[PDB]
């Protein structure tokens, strides 16, 4: 054929069962700070509902503070998704997931205070250099594979994988952030959500769907990291969607045949054939030839030398992040949307 690998599979099972017990304690039994405890330094990222800011604890430690304007979080699914994000982040623990330190609310806003990861988004490094070599892309992809193996074992789907949401830490490793689309799903779920270039076809077609959409999105991510652009690429979301549902992927001539084979099996419209979704689950991905050089345990243990280490001048350095327009926070004299956000 193509001994340790099977003991390795028992060890995975053992790790995941222990991980599930820790998660469930925090999930069952989830206001740990206040706004005045922090100085606001710079906006690091923005979105339709607020911004993420670099802040400094008035302890000196730096954090990434996500500020959600309750009056912008107005649609039903936008509200549910915010409660999902807080409850999931306070309950998970894994080396490649950002750590939530504090959460609290006031009359106008919700706040989630996370560890500050100063290396920047993978997005800007990838767009600056064009595309990553296959060994470079593989190193990052391996961390995502392990992260999804962890999340899916807790019945969590992530649902917004893309370089914008992957931060590089001081060792060159990835930290997944932005859990706004993440959800506990034991069977299927039905919300039409995510980022157009990364949606699996079943989302677009309004079919109930499951964790296999994360594995499709991993195919999009690996392709984009190795090519510099994603496989379904068009000016307007409706055009992107048409391309996805045909699923007629063309690959750059420099992609290895091992890479193309993995991607054809991840970008598989037929769910009875999509890797990650079959009887052997994640192991069809982990044991694929494109990953034959990958030491999964050494990646988990952070023993592998990273492709590059971002440059940093000190704590609170923001040089690896782009600039955004700043807008002062205004806390209203009156409480807003207190009912919608009672569990936060």
């Amino acid at each position: 054929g193509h001994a340790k690998k099977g003991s390795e599979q028992e060890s995975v099972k053992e790790f995941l069962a222990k991980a599930k017990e820790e998660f469930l304690k925090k999930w069952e039994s989830p206001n740990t700070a206040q706004l005045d405890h922090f100085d606001r330094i710079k906006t690091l990222g923005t979105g339709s509902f607020g911004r993420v800011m670099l802040v400094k604890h008035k302890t000196g430690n730096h954090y990434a503070m996500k500020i959600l304007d309750k009056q912008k979080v107005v649609k039903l699914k936008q509200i549910e998704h915010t409660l999902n994000e807080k409850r999931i982040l306070q309950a998970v623990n894994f080396p490649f997931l950002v750590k939530l330190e504090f959460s609290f609310k006031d009359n106008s806003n919700l706040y989630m205070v996370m560890e500050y990861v100063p290396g920047g988004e993978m997005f800007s490094h990838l767009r600056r250099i064009g595309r990553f070599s296959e060994p470079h892309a593989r190193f990052y992809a391996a961390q995502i594979v392990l992260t999804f193996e962890y999340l899916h074992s807790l019945d969590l789907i992530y649902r917004d994988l893309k370089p914008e949401n992957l931060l590089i830490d001081q060792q060159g490793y990835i930290q997944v952030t932005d859990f706004g689309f993440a959800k506990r799903v034991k069977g299927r779920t039905w919300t039409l959500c995510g980022t157009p270039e990364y949606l699996a076809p079943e989302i677009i077609l309004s079919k109930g769907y499951n964790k296999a959409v994360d594995w499709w999105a991993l195919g999009v991510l690996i392709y984009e990291m190795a090519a510099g652009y994603p496989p379904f690429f068009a000016d307007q979301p409706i055009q992107i969607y048409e391309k996805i549902v045909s699923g007629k992927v063309r690959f750059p001539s420099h992609f290895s045949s091992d890479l193309k084979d993995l991607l054809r099996n991840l970008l598989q419209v037929d769910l009875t054939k999509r890797f990650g979704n079959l009887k052997n689950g994640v192991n069809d991905i982990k044991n694929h030839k494109w990953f034959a050089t990958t030491d999964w345990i050494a990646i988990y243990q952070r023993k592998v030398e990273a492709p590059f280490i971002p440059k940093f001048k000190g704590p609170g350095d923001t040089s690896n992040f782009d600039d955004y327009e700043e807008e002062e926070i205004r806390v209203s004299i009156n409480e807003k949307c207190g009912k919608e956000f009672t569990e936060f």
Partner: peptide
């Protein structure tokens, strides 16, 4: 010919 800048996720398409 596609989107090269940061991409907004949609919470309910």
């Amino acid at each position: 010919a596609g989107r090269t800048g940061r991409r907004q996720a949609i919470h309910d398409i």
